Subunit: 111 residues, 3 copies
């Protein structure tokens, strides 16, 4: 029996070392995934009290951002499409103004 | 003694397999948390060189965003509340312009 | 031999318990890193169907954000620098308008 008992002790141990092998290569691909997430997630910076879009040495864009609600106490982020429509209306208004000034000028010439 | 030695060898092994049980159900709830974070964190996309707010098939909003600083080289994100005030002022200016054009029209009728 | 066999069984076990020690202090500094990432990553909130910049009790800023593209279907986030230029142009246009109204007023006084 005891040489049997020893046999079953080695069976249970060689199983232990292969359950451990599975752990160790596995733990690694997780510590790897955590490292990846730290580098590429947009993270809070406590030294500035804000989330920081710094990545690959500098300020970075955020894209694939859907339009934010335009309302009085909205906390939605706003996108360039939204901004473009504002920019467009501004350029129209500058042109209009110009032309109003010309007309005022013409009137002041008739008087 | 040797049947005692064998007893203490099995004591140390049945402890090993229950320290290992604790590891394996634990490692799982961590590989689970890492998977969750990958899916729901706002992450850098190297194919576009920007953080991407894509989620659940499409562009997504960002909300609970506090007002950004409006200054010359500000890198703060801006919110819809901010934008709304700009939109409001634009609508006022369009109305004013309209009305200026009417008045100019009336003057040109008196001459 | 069997007291040798027992010796080599204890050698393989005291190795097992120190490979396990390495695991357990290691797993901890990972479950720690996952907890940190959950707290400080900007994460999707399924109850609102948007990424949420809430952190340390309230709405938060996002900074170090590079300028977004201003174009018709842009999904880029826009920054305060961008917004400031819009704000500036608005303030110019209000002043101009004022002054146009004065001039219109003066003309209406001459007639």
């Amino acid at each position: 029996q005891i040489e049997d008992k020893i046999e079953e002790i080695l069976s249970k141990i060689y199983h232990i070392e292969n359950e451990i092998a599975r752990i160790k290569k596995l733990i690694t691909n997780t510590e790897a995934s955590v490292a990846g997430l730290a580098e590429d997630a947009l993270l809070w910076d406590e030294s500035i009290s804000a989330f920081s879009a710094s990545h690959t040495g500098n300020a970075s864009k955020i894209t694939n951002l859907a339009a934010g609600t335009l309302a009085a106490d909205s906390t939605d982020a706003v996108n360039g499409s939204q901004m473009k429509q504002i920019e467009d209306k501004i350029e129209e208004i500058l042109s209009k103004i110009y032309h109003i000034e010309n007309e005022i000028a013409r009137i002041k010439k008739l008087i």
